[PDB]
């Protein structure tokens, strides 16, 4: 039994950093190899991919976050079972957050899906930034009605990373 999880969000929000922390802590035996199609500055170009055990297999993907890469970002959303939306905490990236969530809903509507149709967890990432915004302000922009779990994170340090993944796993399972 196979599930696909897509880490979505604006450019540089920390989507790849999530899969890399996860990859570094999951033991050999319970993961496959991480694949990344990235430019030399290591920004993601097409996707990251990380297969793991939690029979049931979870295939974790990230999407490139640049606004002008929507065509490849939407291929990655095909058949998604659950989504982790990685929101950036930086003050100057708040509207980028909203644009990504709007873009997410639009891409999902091309497959005939609404945001109710797919489990979604908001991760508010980069809590370590000195000027970080309140969690609730970030959340009120990407999830005005608070319909979605929210979790805080510092992906470069692991904080929130596995708890975000268990949360979305939980929802994808409860969905069957």
């Amino acid at each position: 039994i196979n599930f696909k999880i897509v880490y979505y969000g604006p450019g540089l929000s920390g989507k790849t950093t999530n899969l890399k922390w996860i990859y570094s802590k999951v033991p050999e035996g319970r993961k496959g190899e991480m694949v990344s199609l990235a430019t030399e500055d290591e920004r993601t170009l097409f996707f990251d991919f990380l297969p793991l055990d939690i029979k049931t297999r979870f295939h974790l993907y990230t999407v490139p976050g640049q606004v002008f890469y929507n065509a490849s970002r939407k291929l990655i959303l095909r058949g998604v079972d659950g989504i982790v939306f990685v929101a950036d905490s930086a003050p100057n990236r708040l509207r980028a957050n909203a644009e990504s969530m709007r873009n997410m809903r639009e891409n999902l509507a091309e497959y005939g899906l609404t945001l109710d149709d797919v489990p979604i967890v908001i991760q508010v990432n980069k809590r370590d930034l000195p000027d970080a915004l309140p969690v609730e302000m970030v959340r009120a922009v990407v999830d005005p009605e608070g319909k979605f779990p929210v979790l805080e994170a510092v992906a470069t340090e692991g904080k929130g990373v596995f708890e975000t993944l268990k949360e979305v796993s939980r929802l994808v399972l409860a969905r069957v």
Binding site: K4, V35, F46, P51, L75, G79
Partner: protein, 133 residues
């Protein structure tokens, strides 16, 4: 979705095995468009494959991007693809709307047969994919 078990699983595997023999390919996979390995077989003469989940996610995203290019141009589809290196190649074709046949072959395999039995294997697997919808 497409969940493959039971008799259809067994029939898919028998197709993959027969295709390996008829073509001389190293590896045969049925993958879904989402990137999941649904059945795989390896020719017993051949070395260990590269990680098959890597192979299958790369192949599914190649197919995703090329199908999107087709649709961009007003086409339902391009044809089966043969990727050809100096020694190694890949034959990738549709097994119905939800899956792909993948053949990995080397210099020892005759390309005519790869294409020819690859295409019949695709068609047999689409038939099997339907009975697992």
């Amino acid at each position: 979705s497409l969940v493959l078990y039971g008799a259809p699983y067994a029939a898919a595997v028998e197709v993959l095995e027969e295709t390996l023999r008829e073509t001389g390919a190293r590896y045969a996979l049925l993958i879904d468009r989402k990137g999941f390995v649904l059945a795989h077989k390896e020719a017993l003469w051949a070395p260990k494959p590269p990680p098959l989940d890597t192979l299958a996610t790369l192949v599914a995203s190649n197919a995703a991007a090329t199908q999107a290019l087709a649709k961009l141009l007003g086409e339902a589809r391009f044809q089966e693809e043969v990727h050809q290196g100096e020694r190694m190649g890949l034959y990738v074709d549709e097994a119905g709307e939800h899956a792909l046949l993948v053949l990995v072959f080397d210099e020892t395999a005759p390309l005519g047969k790869v294409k020819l039995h690859g295409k019949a294997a695709a068609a047999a697997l689409a038939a099997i994919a339907e009975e697992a919808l």
